[PDB]
Swiss-Prot record, chain B:
The lineage of its organism: Eukaryota, Metazoa, Chordata, Craniata, Vertebrata. Changing residue 144 to F: Reduced PPP-RNA-binding. Reduced capped RNA-binding. Loss of capped RNA-binding and decreased translation inhibition of viral RNAs lacking 2'-O-methylation of the 5' cap. Changing residue 174 to H: Abolishes PPP-RNA-binding. Loss of capped RNA-binding. Loss of translation inhibition of viral RNAs lacking 2'-O-methylation of the 5' cap. GO terms for molecular function: enzyme inhibitor activity; RNA binding; RNA sequestering activity. It comes from Homo sapiens (Human). This is Antiviral innate immune response effector IFIT1.
RNA sequence: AAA
RNA sequence: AAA
């Protein structure tokens, strides 16, 4: 009966935060990193999230210490209702019901005073934002909801700085999910400009705008914001993360490594940094290949070794880091370690990424591996088709269609009356939009089928 | 040397008239019918054609009689004489009387030179262009495109010429009849028919054609006005009865149409067009009864008249088809098969007709012979003639029905899957067409 | 956080 | 000249 009341409270226990079991350690580390290095006006939500994590670990006593710390720092506000809601849920799981009802009454009293329509569900913009920040911290499966929280606020107060920031970040990350789909549009460009305007001293938002400007070819304008963000000390380690990405994609790879190595001293468990660092060594590996033996060779194997070390570290800390697992498997091919590349690809082939489009790249690169390392056109076709089976138009999907086409044409030159090759070729022409030639080949193949 | 000059004369011997052997008896009759009952200003052409027909029969002496009869009524000077003189030249050449052939050659040369004609023997004038058009228009449908060209050639210099306006309108009307069942068929012969009536106000033959064409285009009321005008006047009676009867039959007044056909048959009993029209009347009354002694009686009468038409003109394709379809009504599946196989060996001048042959034979195989396989064979053969039409759309539907029936008994039949995909392709559903092709190609994995 |  |  008390449970029916607790379920109405707005807090981490009722926000249906999707948290995979394999992501708990990395989540905890990312929460702790944020407590130390992220500069924000309010730090109530982050400590409340830490408490919820502790609870999920079975350390309920430790959660109360993070809730009580969240309340002490609050002294230095309606957002307290989030803390009181977690208090109520905690005491409930611990059998201390009497104390739980006290915090239910605290929430009810405030709800009573603010003429709130609900007995326990406080309807205000601050708590909408707290829900948004929690979702935006617990993995990509929650970003659509997170954007909705912030968007809900901007429908009544379009210049609310906090929601404008959460909305911009969510939109930017969702754009990142679709960065390789055809006709993808920068929905997050204007929201980011608006967020920077309403948070002029926020560097975290400035670097995201820079990267989005770089995405749209306006690289020069983006670097202006990079320099502005690096100026203020606000959340500098996070500015180092995204500043490195900008400089790497700009071509100044050496500048990025320096920033990442600095950032790694502060957040040594950041899988994002480990991945970025690996991408840097991968970038330097392509630079030398342009011009290997001697000290030139010792450099590649050293960098390949480092890229593997950091990619291997990222997936160790976060086993759900799919694209890092993919970069790892691809790097083992650069090292000639087909044994380990096969091992990781088999891991990737059993995954179901949140961004399902990523599965195209998994099948595509494994297809190339089959085509070039294993010289097995049969298995290359299987995985080029599986990549194509995810209809969402993209760059990798076009590459899968072309690789399928070229490789199928090779079969027909050795055997022009191969039924399977004719039908696959007709299938290719269907994907290319030329329906007349597709019907032609399907019909030609269906004649050979009549035997 | 003499032959080279004869090949330059404009007459039936150099007009490349396509006359199938089996069409000679009917042509000879239709020519005699025309001489007797068609009222035209100049009857020189039809007698010259009659002469040419007799020459082809091996009766050269009888041909000269028709050329000399053609020269008389003309006098009752005309440039059309060159057609007769040209035929005379050709006749005497075949009969070894070369010296006489040269006499007529000189007569043609003498006229060509006096009229400042560019050629020595080929007279360029609209009168002979019309004569060529009339000859082509009388020797079957394979010549109609050339016929229209002759009259069109004259209308390019004299758009108000009444004679060429009539020939062009009749050729266009018949040519529109060839494409009457094709999709998006346009009535290109309507306005030429109105103009032909304007320039030939006392010509009922053209009036009834304008009526029938109005009936085709939903203007049946306006058409019946011209039908009554043609019947009032008694010019070309028996011919006005033919097309008036068709007009009333397609309206629903069958008894009125039978009255006119039985009158016209007394005058031109050998006309295959009448016997066919009579059969269509009995077929119409048959359908009326359906919606016993009379039914079996008329079926016997319709078969008798269709049988009479094909007997007199073996190349009368659609009459042969109405015959085969009528034997089915009579429960004589043996004669139907016999006549359908005759049709299956034909090659109609109007190739589109072969869709109806295969389509109706497909139905015969589906419903009477209880063989869907042959029905599919012939529905496909009707479809293979890509010209869009009513029958082709019905062949696609009939094929679709059968393939769907087969799939109910066996959903994993490769052939049925591939055919249904072929069907959806003809219907314009490329997406559903590719779907069933891919489904079939999977079963073809082994 | 690859692309 | 069926349609």
């Amino acid at each position: 009966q008390v449970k029916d009341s607790l379920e109405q409270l707005r807090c981490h226990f009722t926000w249906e935060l999707s948290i995979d079991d394999d992501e708990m350690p990395d989540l905890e580390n990312r929460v702790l990193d944020q407590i130390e290095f992220l500069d924000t006006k309010y730090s109530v939500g982050i400590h409340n999230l830490l408490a919820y994590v502790k609870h999920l670990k079975g350390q309920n006593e430790e959660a109360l210490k993070s809730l009580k710390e969240a309340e002490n720092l609050m002294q230095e506000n309606v957002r307290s209702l989030v803390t009181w809601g977690n208090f109520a849920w905690m005491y409930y799981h611990m059998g201390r019901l009497a104390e739980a009802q006290t915090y239910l009454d605290k929430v009810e009293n405030i709800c009573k005073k603010l003429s709130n329509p609900f007995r326990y569900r406080m309807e205000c913009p601050e708590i909408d934002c707290e829900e948004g920040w929690a979702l935006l911290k617990c993995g990509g499966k929650n970003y659509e909801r997170a954007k909705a929280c912030f968007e809900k606020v901007l429908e009544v107060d379009p210049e609310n700085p906090e929601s404008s920031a959460g909305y911009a970040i969510s939109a930017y990350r969702l754009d990142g999910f679709k960065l390789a789909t055809k006709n993808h549009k920068p929905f997050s460009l204007l929201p980011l400009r608006q967020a920077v305007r309403l948070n002029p001293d926020n560097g975290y938002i400035k670097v995201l705008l820079a990267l989005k400007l770089q995405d749209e070819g306006q690289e020069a304008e983006g670097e202006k914001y990079i320099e502005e963000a690096l100026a203020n000390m606000s959340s500098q380690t996070y500015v180092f993360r995204y500043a490195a990405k900008f400089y790497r994609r700009k071509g100044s790879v050496d500048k990025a490594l320096e920033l990442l190595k600095k950032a790694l001293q502060e957040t040594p468990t950041s899988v994002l940094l480990h991945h970025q660092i690996g991408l840097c060594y991968k970038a330097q590996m392509i630079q030398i290949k342009e011009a290997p033996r001697g000290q030139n060779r010792e450099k590649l194997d050293k960098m390949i070794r480092s890229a593997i070390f950091h990619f291997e570290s990222a997936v160790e800390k976060k086993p759900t880091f799919e694209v890092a697992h993919l970069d790892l498997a691809r790097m083992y091919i650069e090292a000639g370690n087909h044994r380990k590349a096969e091992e990781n690809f088999q891991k990737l082939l059993c995954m179901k990424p949140v961004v399902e489009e990523t599965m195209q790249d998994i099948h595509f690169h494994y297809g190339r591996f089959q085509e070039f390392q294993k010289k097995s056109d049969v298995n290359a076709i299987i995985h080029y088709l599986k990549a194509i089976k995810i209809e969402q138009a993209s760059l990798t999907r076009d590459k899968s269609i072309n690789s399928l086409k070229k490789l199928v044409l090779r079969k027909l030159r050795r055997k022009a009356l191969d039924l399977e090759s004719l039908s696959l070729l007709g299938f290719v022409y269907k994907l290319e939009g030329n329906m007349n030639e597709a019907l032609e080949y399907y019909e030609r193949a269906l004649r050979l089928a009549a035997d």
